[PDB]
């Protein structure tokens, strides 16, 4: 317990930091995907 709030907190913060990097990638990838899909449909329509 003594260092477990710290181990859990460091895990939470590291996971949150990675989550955010990955969530920001998710948003970037989704926006690119949607725009890319719209480009796809743009070209498919063409």
């Amino acid at each position: 317990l003594k260092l477990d709030k710290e181990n859990a907190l460091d895990r939470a913060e590291q996971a949150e930091a990675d989550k955010k990097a990955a969530e920001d990638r998710s948003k970037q990838l989704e926006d690119e995907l949607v725009s890319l899909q719209k480009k796809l449909k743009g070209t498919e329509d063409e």
């Binding site: 955010k20 969530e23 948003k27 949607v34 719209k38 449909k41």
Partner: protein, 375 residues
Amino acid sequence: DEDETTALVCDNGSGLVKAGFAGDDAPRAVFPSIVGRPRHQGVMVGMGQKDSYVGDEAQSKRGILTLKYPIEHGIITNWDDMEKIWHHTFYNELRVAPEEHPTLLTEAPLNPKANREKMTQIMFETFNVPAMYVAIQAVLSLYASGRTTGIVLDSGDGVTHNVPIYEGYALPHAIMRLDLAGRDLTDYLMKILTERGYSFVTTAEREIVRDIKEKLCYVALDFENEMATAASSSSLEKSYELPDGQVITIGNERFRCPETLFQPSFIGMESAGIHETTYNSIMKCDIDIRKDLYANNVMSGGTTMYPGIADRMQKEITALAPSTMKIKIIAPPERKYSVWIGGSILASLSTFQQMWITKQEYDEAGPSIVHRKCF
């Protein structure tokens, strides 16, 4: 502690108020928009006991306090209580006296005018702020969310505003203001928990329920199937520990309350629900606008923090939407804190340094000046 006269920023909702200084990416402190007053006389020695409590003080001693929120469905009606909140917020937690720093406050596009007039007047006449600027919550939501175009669902505590914005412009013909908000969800949860044997009727209890809601409740992507399961099995129940050591669990109530956003009739409101309200904001807009609003549905404010709301809203709009169009909801981690963040962004823009009301123009014109100077 600042080395420049940065603006101070305060996002004062009907629920909670967020504050910090312009240039940060988060508020430094969060307080409820509450001034508490005792309804009982203390007996024991060493129990504090104040005539009035402000912000976090009102919550800490709430067991015996009436908790008054000075803001009613987006408007300040009690200016004395907002002075207590702003003194404490700026002077004690941000550690800055407004006398040497400009201040930015926020309101919804259809928020009653007296709100912007008192926000401006209080900071100029009680705090002697050198300048003021009442911001549009729709703008701030878009600046925090990284958009210029999209639907702003600011789902606050007192009101869900619902305004489509295109290329930085308002599209006012399509605003569908809804009197269904986070405050109604808290009240409804107190009532649904009562049905299960856990009655919540006091102000202290209201805050307990507010905390229960924030941690245990969700909307569900499929209400009827989630309901049928939750009503049939303990597998969808979740516990919460109450301050007196009692334990409360929530079953289909866990979503039946949040469902009020989609079914406002549960609290007695005449409305088609948050997803039709949102949709009403995207189809009413012009034929060459609709496509950009569908692809940029932007959440700000709280209630956006329910685990399934971004996905159910995207699904409901998609179901109502025409084919071909891309429907997407932006639901950033800056959720509930986004309007404050946008306030920080706006206060510091070089393009916005001419938008500030100075404490010269203010005194020459009087409190009504905010009408011509802000928006």
